[PDB]
Amino acid sequence: MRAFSTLDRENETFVPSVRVYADGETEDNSFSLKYRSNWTPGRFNSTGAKTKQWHYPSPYSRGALSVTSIDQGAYKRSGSSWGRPYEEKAGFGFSLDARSCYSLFPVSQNLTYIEVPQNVANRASTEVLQKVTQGNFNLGVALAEARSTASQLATQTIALVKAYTAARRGNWRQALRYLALNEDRKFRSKHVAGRWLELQFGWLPLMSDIQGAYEMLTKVHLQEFLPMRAVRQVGTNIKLDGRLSYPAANFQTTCNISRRIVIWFYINDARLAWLSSLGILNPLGIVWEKVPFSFVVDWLLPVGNMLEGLTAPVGCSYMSGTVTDVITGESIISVDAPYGWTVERQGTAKAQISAMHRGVQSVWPTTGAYVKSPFSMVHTLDALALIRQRLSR
Amino acid sequence: QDLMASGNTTVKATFGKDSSVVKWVVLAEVLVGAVMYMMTKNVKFLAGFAIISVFIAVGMAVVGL
Amino acid sequence: QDLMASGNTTVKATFGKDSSVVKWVVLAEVLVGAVMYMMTKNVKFLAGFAIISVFIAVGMAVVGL
Amino acid sequence: QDLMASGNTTVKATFGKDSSVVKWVVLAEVLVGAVMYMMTKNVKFLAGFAIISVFIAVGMAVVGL
Amino acid sequence: QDLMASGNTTVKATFGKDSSVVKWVVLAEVLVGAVMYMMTKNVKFLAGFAIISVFIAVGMAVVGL
Amino acid sequence: QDLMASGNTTVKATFGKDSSVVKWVVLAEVLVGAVMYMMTKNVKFLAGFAIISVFIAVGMAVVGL
Amino acid sequence: QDLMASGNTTVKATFGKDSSVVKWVVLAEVLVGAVMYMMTKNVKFLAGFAIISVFIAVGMAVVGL
Amino acid sequence: QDLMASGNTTVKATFGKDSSVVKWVVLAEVLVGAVMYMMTKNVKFLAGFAIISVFIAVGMAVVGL
Amino acid sequence: QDLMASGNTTVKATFGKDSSVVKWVVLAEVLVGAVMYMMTKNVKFLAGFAIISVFIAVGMAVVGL
Numbered sequence A: 001m002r003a004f005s006t007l008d009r010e011n012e013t014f015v016p017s018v019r020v021y022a023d024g025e026t027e028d029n030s031f032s033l034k035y036r037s038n039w040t041p042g043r044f045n046s047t048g049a050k051t052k053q054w055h056y057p058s059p060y061s062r063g064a065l066s067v068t069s070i071d072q073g074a075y076k077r078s079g080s081s082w083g084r085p086y087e088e089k090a091g092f093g094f095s096l097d098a099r100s101c102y103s104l105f106p107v108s109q110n111l112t113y114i115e116v117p118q119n120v121a122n123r124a125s126t127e128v129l130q131k132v133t134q135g136n137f138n139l140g141v142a143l144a145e146a147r148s149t150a151s152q153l154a155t156q157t158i159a160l161v162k163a164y165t166a167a168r169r170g171n172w173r174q175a176l177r178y179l180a181l182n183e184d185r186k187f188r189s190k191h192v193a194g195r196w197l198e199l200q201f202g203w204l205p206l207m208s209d210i211q212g213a214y215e216m217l218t219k220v221h222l223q224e225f226l227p228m229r230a231v232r233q234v235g236t237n238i239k240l241d242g243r244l245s246y247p248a249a250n251f252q253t254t255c256n257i258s259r260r261i262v263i264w265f266y267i268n269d270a271r272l273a274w275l276s277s278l279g280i281l282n283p284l285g286i287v288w289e290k291v292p293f294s295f296v297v298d299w300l301l302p303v304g305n306m307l308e309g310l311t312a313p314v315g316c317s318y319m320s321g322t323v324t325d326v327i328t329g330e331s332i333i334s335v336d337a338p339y340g341w342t343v344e345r346q347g348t349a350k351a352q353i354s355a356m357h358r359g360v361q362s363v364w365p366t367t368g369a370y371v372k373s374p375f376s377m378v379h380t381l382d383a384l385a386l387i388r389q390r391l392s393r
Numbered sequence B, C, D, E, F, G, H, I: 001q002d003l004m005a006s007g008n009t010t011v012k013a014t015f016g017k018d019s020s021v022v023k024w025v026v027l028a029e030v031l032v033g034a035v036m037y038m039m040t041k042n043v044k045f046l047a048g049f050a051i052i053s054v055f056i057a058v059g060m061a062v063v064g065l
C-alpha cells in the first residue's frame, strides 16, 4: 500500500491557441478544458458473522484512480493563403477523464477484481502450504499460554531421568545437583533401595509440579480454540503495452500485483481425544515403603506417551482465509501527430492506480495435510533422547 | 434483532453506476439504432445519446445505503 | 392477556424504510428499463422514476406501531 | 464480495471501435442509399457520410474502460 | 417529504445554453440549406440565420430552476 | 445435559459455500436457459446471472455455528 | 468428517467448457434461426452470434472448484 | 471418469458445413423471396444472397471439437 | 456414423433449376406487372425481366451437393 488521496478535485489547464503572423500583429484566445484530477468510488462497508470463538472477516475494498500531469506539442509552423495571418503556437491538448484511465490495467470498474496470471496464483499457493506442513508459522494468543505450561513438564524430566539412571550405575554425586540439594551430606544405608528412601523430601515437590501442569493441558488447553496465522506475500512485475483510446494516442505501462494469502486454521484431530481422558497416579496417596525401587519406569506410561504425541504431525481444519489483492503501478501515455506542422516538444499523460481488496474463498487441499505441532521446542526434544536410550532402547 | 437481507453489499457492486450494468446498456442502442437506416432512414433515434447517464444517476442515488 | 405475535421489533427493522427492502426495489426498474431499447425503443417506461418514494411512503406510514 | 458480470474483457472486444461491428454498419448506407435512385432520385440520403464516426465516438467514450 | 426527480443538476448542464445542444442546432441548417442550390436555386432559406439565438432564449429562460 | 444433534460438523461441510452444492446449482441455469431459444427466443431469462452468489450468501451467513 | 457429494471430478468433465455442452449449444441457433426466413424474414435474430461465449464464461468461472 | 455426452461424432456430421443443413437453408430464401413480387414488388429482399456463407462460418467454426 | 438428413436426392430434384420452381416464378410477374397499367400506367416494373435467371443462379450454385 502507498499514499493516496480520496478527495475528488478538478484542474483547468489552458493551451494562447495558435500565434498569428501576417505582419507584426499576433493575438488569439485560449481553451479552458473542465478535467478530473482523481476519482474515488463509493465506500463499500460490509459486515460478517460474530460468534463466541472467532470473529469472521468482512469484505472491504477501496481503490483510487489518481491522475497527475497531462506534454501540449509545437505543431502549427506557418502557411497562410487568405491574405493575412498564420504563426506557430501548439493549439492540441485533448484532456482525459479520470474515470477511464484503467484501460491499460486488467482491473474492473469496482477496483476489486484483478486478472491474475497462471504463473502468479499458482506460485502463491505452493509457498504457503510448504511452510505450514514443514513448520513455519506465527503463534497466536492461545498458543502463548499453551506452550508455556507444556514445556515445563519436559524440563523437569531432565533432572529426574538423569538422576534415576545414576543410582543403577553408582554415581551419587550427580543426582545431588539435579535435585537441588548439597554435596556435603553423607548416607547411612548401603543397599540400592535404602539410599533412595533417605532423601525422600528431595523429590516430593517435584512430583506435585508435574500433576499441576498435566491436569491443565488434557482438560483445558485441549478443549478450547488454538488459532494459527500464516503470512506470505507474493508480488511480481508485469509489463504490458497498449492501439487507439479517445484520440489515435498508442498508450507501455508497468504494474506490481501483490498478494498476501492469510489462512486461519486450528488443530483438529480424532486421536487427540484419547490422550485427554487418561489419568495419572498420585504419589501422595501411595505409600513408598512397600513399593519397590522399580516403579519410576512404570509410572512414566501416561507421561511418556504425551512426549511422543506432541512431535507427530497433527492435521488441521481451515475456516475462512483472506486473499489480499493490491496492485501498484503507473501508466505513461505519444497523443497522434496531425498533418503538415513542424517543431516537436509530443503529448504525454501519466496516471496512477492503487487498489485493495481482500478475498473470501481460501485454498486448502481436501485430502488433508500433516501439520507439524508447534510443541517441537528444543527443551522438549531433549526428553525423548533420555527415554529411548536409557529407559527403553 | 436486526435485519438479515443485507450485510454483504453484493448487489450494490453488481447492479450500480460503477459496475458492469452501464457497459451492457450502452451497446444495445448502437446495435439497433445504427442499423435501422434500412427501413426507416430518418433522424428519430438520436435522443438516447445523453439520457443514459442521466437515468442511471437519478435512479441509483435514491437511497444510497 | 396481551398479544404474542409481536414484542420483538424484528419485522419492522427488516421490512421498512431504513432496511434493505428499499434497495432491492430501486434497481428492478433499470434492469428491464435500460435494456428494452432493442425491441420497443420508445419513451414509455419513464413514469417509474418518481413512484418509488411515493409508494413506499403511503404503505409504511399507515400504522407505524 | 466482488461482481461476476464482468472480469473477462470479452464483450468489450466484440462491440467496440477496434472490432467487427464498425465494418458491418458502414456498408448498410451504400446498400440502401445507392439503390433508391429508382423511386426518389433526389439528394437527401447523403447526410450519413460523416455521422457514422461521430455516433460511435459519443457512445463508446462514455465508459471506454 | 420533498421531491426526488431533481437535486442533481444533471439535465440542466446537458440541455441548456452553456452546453452542447446549441452546437448541434447551428450546423443542421448549413448541412442542407447550403447544398440545395442544385434543385431549387432560389433565395428563400435565409430567415434561419437569426431565429437560432431567439428560440433558445424563449425556452430556456422560462423556469430557470 | 448438552445437545446430541450436532457435535460432528458434518452437515456444515456438505451443505455450504465451500462444498459441492454451489457447483450443482450453477449449471442448472445454463442447462435449460441456453436451450429454450427454440420456442421463446427472447431476452427474458437473463436476470439470473447475479442472484446465484447473492442467495448463497444471505442464507449461509445467518447462523454460522 | 468431510463431504461425500464430490471427490470424483465427474460432473466437471461432463458439464464444462472442455466437454460436450459447448457443442450442443452452438448449433441450436442455426437450427431455428437460419430457417425462419420463410415466414418472418427480418433482421432481428442476429445478436446471438456473440452471446454464446459470454454466457459460458460468466457461469463456469463462478466457483471453479 | 470422463464424459459420456460425446464420443460418437454423430451430431457433427449431421449438423455441419459438409452435411445437408447447408442445402435446406439456401432454398428457403428464394422460396418466398422470388414470389413476393405480387403485392410488394420492390427491391428489398436482396441483401440475403451473401449472409448465408457468413453466418455459417461464425457459427460452425466456434469450437470445432 | 454418417448423416441421415440426405441420401435420397428428393429436395434437389424438386427445388432446383431443372424442376418446376423456375416455372412458377416466371409467370408471377406478368400476372401483376402486365395489369398495373390501369391505376399507375408508367414504365417502372420493367427491371424484373432479367433478374429471374440471375437470382436462380446465385443461390442454387452455392453448395451444389
Ligand SMILES: CCOP(=O)(O)OC[C@H](O)CO
Pocket (backbone or CB within 6 Å): B032, C038, C039, C040, G042, G043, G044, G045
Ligand atoms: C434488430 C432488432 O429489431 P426489433 O426492433 O426487435 O424489430 C421489431 C420489429 O419486428 C421490426 O422493427
Ligand SMILES: CCOP(=O)(O)OC[C@H](O)CO
Pocket (backbone or CB within 6 Å): C042, C043, C044, C045
Ligand atoms: C410518448 C408517450 O407514450 P405513452 O403514452 O407512454 O404510450 C402510448 C402508446 O402506448 C405508445 O406505444
Ligand SMILES: CCOP(=O)(O)OC[C@H](O)CO
Pocket (backbone or CB within 6 Å): D037, D038, D039, D040, I043, I044, I045
Ligand atoms: C422511367 C423511369 O422509371 P423509374 O425510374 O423506375 O420510376 C421513376 C419514379 O419512380 C417515378 O415515381
Ligand SMILES: CCOP(=O)(O)OC[C@H](O)CO
Pocket (backbone or CB within 6 Å): D042, D043, D044, E032, E035, E036
Ligand atoms: C435538398 C437537400 O435534401 P433535404 O433538405 O432532405 O430535402 C428536403 C425535401 O425533400 C426537398 O426535396
Ligand SMILES: CCOP(=O)(O)OC[C@H](O)CO
Pocket (backbone or CB within 6 Å): E038, E039, E040, E041
Ligand atoms: C435537376 C434540375 O436541373 P438543374 O439544371 O440541376 O437545376 C436547374 C433548376 O433547378 C431548374 O430546374
Ligand SMILES: CCOP(=O)(O)OC[C@H](O)CO
Pocket (backbone or CB within 6 Å): E043, E044, E045, E046
Ligand atoms: C427571401 C425570403 O422570401 P422568399 O422565401 O423568397 O419568399 C418570397 C416570395 O415567395 C418570393 O419567392
Ligand SMILES: CCOP(=O)(O)OC[C@H](O)CO
Pocket (backbone or CB within 6 Å): C031, C032, C035, C036, F043, F044, F045, F046
Ligand atoms: C431483459 C428482461 O426484460 P424483457 O423481458 O426484455 O422486457 C420486460 C418485459 O417482459 C417486456 O417484454
Ligand SMILES: CCOP(=O)(O)OC[C@H](O)CO
Pocket (backbone or CB within 6 Å): B038, B039, D031, D032, D035, D036, H042, H043, H044, H045
Ligand atoms: C432499398 C433497399 O431495400 P430496403 O431498404 O429493404 O427497402 C425498403 C423500402 O422499400 C425503402 O423505401
